[PDB]
Design a protein around this ligand. Structure first.
Ligand SMILES: CCc1nnc(N)s1
Lengths: 172, 172
């Protein structure tokens, strides 16, 4: 089968995720502000649903017919351990464990972001090791396994200078 | 993880091995082909084999990899150290899996008695399978970490539990 990783796609100034052959999710601030098409489809062909830092695209034709439809939910229960599926331009894949907390407005580097808080579980200083997020990672999905089902519950919106604290933007 | 460390990760037998220096190659004992009499064009005659359980070191009498500098190999790492397992996957994808290392352990894993340094993946809550965890083809991948200005190698991938959450590093 197609891996979860084949769904994570370079987009704008960051990334997005294919939920199904017709549905693509991303972080609002990475989307280009000058465009007549995305993925070769005209904008008149695309339904755009924006809710703060969460955006969903629905295409009128099958862009990724190789995929099956996944479960998309509005965040997850408090204490759920998600994986943020980070791709880097080196060709590195960095799945990082994050403990999910409450939906809130949080001050992240002097700016207000609304979404689900999370705390990285990869430990202290991460030195120069592949253990934390960087600005170019915005749009990377949050996913977890529930019985036999993969669930996607939002997209990477922001992170503190420190690391430890991240914000997952959610569907509303 | 730095390009020089990925350059050292070599497809080998049923898994991988790792160039510590131009003359020193390490791997997991069970991936070595049992009838093999030649390695990198050299006869066994010309090679010093140092086997401790699932850890094997090959010392060559000629420089096989003169493009590399020699780096530090240690006998496992402190309890609590976060390492990266340098895993190569289908088509130049690079998966530096984060792991929290624990005690030296003896385990039974499916049909085998295994001895080495235990650790727990920091990729997700249920890391069973190829997206967030290890697969049997990953045996021999190096365990590395950053200390001050240096990177260290401290073992090679030997096993994972049925659940996938626990891994075992074979150590010198
Ligand atoms: C489930 C992972 C957790 N880390 N800290 C806790 N108290 S729960």
């Amino acid at each position: 089968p197609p891996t979860l990783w084949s769904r994570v796609t370079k987009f704008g100034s960051g990334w997005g995720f294919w939920v199904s052959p017709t549905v693509f999710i991303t972080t609002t601030h990475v989307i280009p502000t000058s465009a007549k098409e995305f993925f070769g489809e005209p904008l008149t062909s695309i339904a755009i649903h924006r809710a703060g830092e969460f955006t969903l695209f629905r295409f009128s034709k099958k862009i990724r017919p190789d995929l099956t439809g996944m479960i998309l939910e509005e965040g997850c229960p408090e204490g759920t351990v998600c994986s943020v599926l980070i791709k880097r331009d080196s060709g590195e894949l960095l799945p990082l464990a994050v403990r999910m907390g409450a939906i809130a407005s949080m001050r992240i580097q002097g700016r207000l972001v609304h979404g689900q808080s999370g705390m990285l579980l990869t430990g202290a200083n991460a030195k120069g090791m592949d253990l934390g997020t960087i600005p170019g990672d915005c749009g990377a999905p949050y996913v977890y396994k529930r019985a036999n089902d993969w669930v996607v519950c939002g997209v990477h919106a922001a992170a503190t200078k420190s690391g430890n604290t991240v914000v997952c933007a959610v569907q509303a």
